[PDB]
């Protein structure tokens, strides 16, 4: 009688242990996948960043109408994608967030390739892509002295602030280095 | 259950480093523009 | 890449192999490679 009851408690012990173990491994599996998720995401948050080589601007009449940004990968970065980035434009007048535009822009920005295959994705360290924003389509065409705070933000999370400072004089200067 | 506690703390250590990691870079970003000007 | 900011045009120059147009070409002055700086004494024009 006692032995029969022990076996019933035994098999119930087996099932309870299996469920407890099953919960343990399944929770471990969830945290393993979650734990793996942050390792790549946080490293891409830290490593993957935009690096701005230069910032020039076209000058028509007497005001800067196009703003040109040449960008590249950071040190030891993965594939930065410039079509999933959102540049922030805090200008002298307006203050909006620029999204990427195809073809084109207006309140959006376009990316033309300078060196490399892709014209929107930085694959290797040597690829350079030019970021195009219409200054006369986001606000008034930038005149002399105007300053723009440009915050390029990667998809994974990065910040490359560049204070595009228009030169104090545009006297007979077709293109100027902001 | 010792491994489960490790995993949650593992995740916490990752963001805490990531939170700390940002501050130097974004501060260096502000000073890189301030120094250049 | 060489960023040319001249009185008129203002573009970024890539590399070619002809003397070019909107590119630049490199001719070795002192050394083996005509495109790669390997030693401290290498000069390429
Ligand atoms: C930033 O890059 C833009 C890439 O399209 C340049 O765009 C061209 O500018 C020319 C001129 O205004 O300089 C126009 O004739 C082209 O149609 C226009 O695509 C822009 O000039 C430059 O600042
Ligand atoms: C860079 O980011 C782009 C953001 O739109 C990606 O764009 C998509 O790419 C898909 C495919 O992988 O080619 C297309 O089916 C989508 O229509 C296109 O928007 C791009 O892939 C990525 O490299
Ligand atoms: C020489 O000094 C002038 C002082 O008035 C400047 O003139 C102003 O320039 C502004 C801008 O910087 O382009 C315009 O918005 C003003 O309307 C204009 O009077 C001039 O620019 C400067 O070179």
Backbone torsions φ then ψ of A119, nearest 5 degrees = -110, 20
Q: Given the structure tokens 């004089």, which residue do they identify?
A: A169
The sign one gets for the Cα dihedral A142, A144, A149, A151 is positive
The sign one gets for the Cα dihedral A73, A79, A82, A84 is negative
Query: Are A80 and A127 within 8 A, CB to CB?
Result: no
Nearest CA in chain B to A51: B29
| The pairing of beta strand A63-73 with beta strand A128-134 | antiparallel
Length of chain A: 178
The SS3 assignment for B2 reads: helix
| C-alpha distance from residue A74 to each of A5, A33, A48, A50, A174 (Å) | 68, 27, 7, 6, 31
Compute the nearest-CA separation of A46 from chain B (Å): 7
Nearest CA in chain B to A153: B26
- Measure the CA–CA gap between A21 and B3, rounded to whole angstroms: 12
Backbone torsions φ then ψ of A86, nearest 5 degrees = -135, 100
**Cβ-Cβ contacts under 8 Å for A76 (sequence gap 6 or more):** A47
Query: Å resolution of this model?
Result: 3.1
The sheet with strand C12-15 has its strands ordered as C2-3, C12-15, C23-24
Question: Distance of alpha carbon A175 from its chain centroid, rounded?
Answer: 28
- Measure the CA–CA gap between A30 and A32, rounded to whole angstroms: 5
- Measure the CA–CA gap between A142 and A134, rounded to whole angstroms: 10
Contact C12 A174 (CB under 8 A): no
- Measure the CA–CA gap between A23 and A46, rounded to whole angstroms: 34
- Measure the CA–CA gap between C10 and C39, rounded to whole angstroms: 32
The residues pairing with C30 across neighbouring beta strands, listed in sequence order, are C43
Backbone torsions φ then ψ of A137, nearest 5 degrees = -120, -10
CB neighbourhood size of A67 (10 A):
25
| C-alpha distance from residue A68 to each of A6, A21, A111, A144, A150 (Å) | 80, 59, 10, 17, 12
Can you read off the two tokens belonging to residue A81? Answer: 């994608």
Ligand 2 neighbour A121 (Cβ under 6 A): yes
Selected for mutation to probe chain A from B12, B19, B22 (highest A CB count within 10 Å) is B22
The sign one gets for the Cα dihedral A79, A83, A89, A95 is negative
| C-alpha distance from residue A143 to each of A135, A149, A151, B33 (Å) | 10, 15, 21, 20
Contact C1 A115 (CB under 8 A): yes
Question: Distance of alpha carbon B26 from its chain centroid, rounded?
Answer: 11
Nearest CA in chain A to B17: A42
Ligand 1 neighbour A58 (Cβ under 6 A): yes
Nearest atom in ligand 2 to the alpha carbon of residue A120 is 1
What is the end-to-end Cα distance of chain A in Å, rounded? 92
Contacts of B3 in chain A (CB under 8 A): 28
Nearest atom in ligand 3 to the alpha carbon of residue A169 is 23
- Measure the CA–CA gap between A151 and B32, rounded to whole angstroms: 14
Contacts of C3 in chain A (CB under 8 A): 53-54, 56, 70
Contact B7 A28 (CB under 8 A): yes
- Measure the CA–CA gap between B37 and B30, rounded to whole angstroms: 11
- Measure the CA–CA gap between A143 and A133, rounded to whole angstroms: 15
């Amino acid at each position: 009688q006692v032995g029969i009851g022990t076996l019933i408690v035994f098999i119930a012990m087996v099932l309870v242990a299996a469920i407890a173990a099953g919960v343990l491994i399944n929770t471990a599996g969830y945290l393993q996948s979650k734990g793996s998720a942050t390792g790549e995401e946080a490293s891409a948050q830290v490593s993957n960043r935009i690096n701005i080589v230069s910032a020039y601007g076209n000058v028509x009449x007497x005001x800067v109408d196009y703003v040109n940004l040449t960008v590249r990968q950071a040190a030891g970065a993965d594939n930065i994608n410039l079509x999933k980035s959102t540049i922030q434009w805090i200008g002298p007048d307006x203050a909006t967030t620029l999204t990427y535009x195809x073809x084109x822009x207006x309140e959006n920005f376009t990316t033309x390739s300078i060196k490399g295959x892709x014209x929107x994705v930085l694959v290797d360290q040597s690829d350079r892509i030019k970021v195009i924003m219409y200054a006369x389509x986001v606000x008034x065409x930038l005149x002399x002295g105007x300053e723009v705070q440009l915050t390029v933000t990667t998809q994974y999370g990065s910040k490359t602030t560049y204070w595009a400072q228009v030169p104090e004089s545009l006297k007979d200067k077709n293109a100027v280095x902001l």
